[PDB]
Amino acid sequence: PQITLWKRPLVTIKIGGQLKEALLDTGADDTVLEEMNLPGRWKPKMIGGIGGFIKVRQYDQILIEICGHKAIGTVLVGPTPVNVIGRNLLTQIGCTLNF
Amino acid sequence: PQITLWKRPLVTIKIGGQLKEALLDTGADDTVLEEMNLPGRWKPKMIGGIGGFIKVRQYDQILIEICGHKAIGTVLVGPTPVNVIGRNLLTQIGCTLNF
Numbered sequence: 001p002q003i004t005l006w007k008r009p010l011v012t013i014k015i016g017g018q019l020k021e022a023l024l025d026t027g028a029d030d031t032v033l034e035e036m037n038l039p040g041r042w043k044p045k046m047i048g049g050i051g052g053f054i055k056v057r058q059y060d061q062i063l064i065e066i067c068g069h070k071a072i073g074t075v076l077v078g079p080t081p082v083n084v085i086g087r088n089l090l091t092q093i094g095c096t097l098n099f
Numbered sequence: 100p101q102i103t104l105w106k107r108p109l110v111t112i113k114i115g116g117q118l119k120e121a122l123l124d125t126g127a128d129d130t131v132l133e134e135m136n137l138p139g140r141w142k143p144k145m146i147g148g149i150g151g152f153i154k155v156r157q158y159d160q161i162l163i164e165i166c167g168h169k170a171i172g173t174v175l176v177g178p179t180p181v182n183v184i185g186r187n188l189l190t191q192i193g194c195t196l197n198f
């Protein structure tokens with residue numbers, strides 16, 4: 001599909017057996033999602049943007065489905081104000097910017 | 100152009116007559132540039148990111164050329180971690196997401 005940017009590029013994702021809403025975000029290197037109690041091991045990380053840094057849990061090789069497109073990769077979980085699908089997963093669904 | 104996402108989508112912009120590098124950021128509503136000198140009036144503003152809120156200088160109706168494509172719109176200047184081009188200008192240059 002083609003998504004215009006008049007509004008935020010929010011889509012439904014499926015992760016950890018749950019449906020969530022997340023932004024398709026070309027400005028994010030990696031994917032950052034709201035607190036969810038996912039099974040398995042994880043590594044602490046700190047990630048920063050406007051306003052400073054937050055603490056997240058890094059989970060590797062997580063299955064995520066984005067608009068029906070399946071992807072597998074790292075997800076960072078913590079108290080983010082917004083869920084972002086970053087480039088690590090957008091590449092896997094073949095997403096480009098075009099103008 | 101068609102821009103894939105294996106690398107950061109960094110492009111050259113021209114603002115205030117000077118060239119700079121900036122990131123095309125679909126997860127940003129607004130365009131935020133690191134501290135710089137820009138002519139004309141501005142107004143204090145607050146903007147929120149992953150890490151909380153920061154103070155910026157709001158410059159309205161600013162000419163800016165992004166990867167060869169002209170825009171005229173609002174530019175926020177302040178302590179962003181990196182120069183980001185947000186949706187207010189991405190729409191102007193006809194940028195969509197495609198997968």
Ligand SMILES: CCOP(=O)(COc1ccc(C[C@H](NC(=O)O[C@H]2CO[C@H]3OCC[C@H]32)[C@H](O)CN(C[C@@H](C)CC)S(=O)(=O)c2ccc([C@H](C)O)cc2)cc1)OCC
Binds near residue numbers: 032049152
């Ligand atoms: C309930 C509402 O919460 P809220 O309003 C904040 O909401 C939002 C918070 C973040 C975003 C996405 C964020 N956009 C953003 O900063 O945009 C600003 C300017 O335009 C406004 O529009 C939206 C906010 C304002 C950007 O796309 C992605 N970022 C990096 C970018 C800045 C370049 C380094 S990142 O997220 O920092 C990030 C860092 C590191 C990683 C891993 C390591 O790779 C992944 C992601 C969208 C909405 O207030 C909170 C106090």
